[PDB]
């Protein structure tokens, strides 16, 4: 199945934190990457006292579970120095979200797909867009035609 993940940083070196992510994602078992988006400098969505982020995109053939995957991106989050603190949206060295696990929907006290705000977000799915422009959601809906309604500002390159 192809998973969708989104990359997200602000702390200790986004560029560095990125790169980690991506070759450590590559060594997950049972999977391999198939596509990266461009990495894109994007201000932060919640507080304002935090760096702005790096936003990208990957694309990860896997024969995983969705929560033996998760395991492992929670475990590349853990060895990148992630912390989370007490505020919501606030800074962090990785985050890797699951935004999509194929065409499933997901719905677990741990594990919720695809991703509930990813539909609001242009740091989600403009990166996503890059890497899968004939992506159709779960209940149908293009991602094309999402980014049309919702006429979300267009990313800067990190
Ligand atoms: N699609 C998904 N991808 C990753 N984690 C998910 C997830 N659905 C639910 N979760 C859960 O989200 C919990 C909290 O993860 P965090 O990374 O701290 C949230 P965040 O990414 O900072 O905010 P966000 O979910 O609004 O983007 C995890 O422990 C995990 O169980
Ligand atoms: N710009 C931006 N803000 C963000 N703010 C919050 C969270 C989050 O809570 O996971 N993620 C991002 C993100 O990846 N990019
Ligand atoms: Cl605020
Ligand atoms: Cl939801
Ligand atoms: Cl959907
Ligand atoms: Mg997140
Ligand atoms: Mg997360």
Same mark, same amino acid.
């Given at each position: 199945?192809?998973?969708?993940? !989104?990359?997200? @940083?602000? #702390?200790?070196? &986004? ?13 997950? &078992?049972? @999977?391999?990457? *198939? /596509?990266?988006? @461009?990495?894109?400098? /994007?201000?932060? %969505? ?9 936003? !990208? !995109?990957?694309? %990860?053939? /896997?024969? *995983? ?7 492992? /991106? ?14 919501? +949206? ?6 890797? =979200? ?18 509930? =705000? ?6 989600? #799915? +403009? &990166? %996503?867009?890059?890497? !899968? ?5 779960? =209940?149908?809906?293009? *991602? ?10 267009? *990313?800067?390159? +990190?």
């Amino acid at each position: 199945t192809v998973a969708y993940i !989104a990359i997200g @940083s602000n #702390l200790a070196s &986004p560029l560095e934190q990125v790169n980690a992510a991506l070759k450590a994602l590559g060594d997950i &078992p049972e @999977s391999h990457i *198939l /596509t990266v988006s @461009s990495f894109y400098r /994007t201000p932060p %969505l919640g507080p304002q006292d935090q760096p702005d982020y790096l936003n !990208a !995109a990957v694309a %990860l053939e /896997t024969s *995983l579970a969705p929560e033996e995957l998760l395991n492992h /991106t929670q475990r590349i989050e853990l060895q990148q120095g992630r912390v989370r603190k007490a505020e919501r +949206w606030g800074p962090r060295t990785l985050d890797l =979200d699951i935004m999509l696990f194929g065409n499933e929907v997901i719905n677990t006290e741990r594990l919720t797909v695809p991703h509930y =705000d990813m539909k609001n977000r242009g740091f989600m #799915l +403009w &990166p %996503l867009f890059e890497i !899968a422009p004939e992506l159709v959601f779960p =209940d149908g809906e293009m *991602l094309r035609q999402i980014l049309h309604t919702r006429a979300f500002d267009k *990313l800067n390159k +990190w």
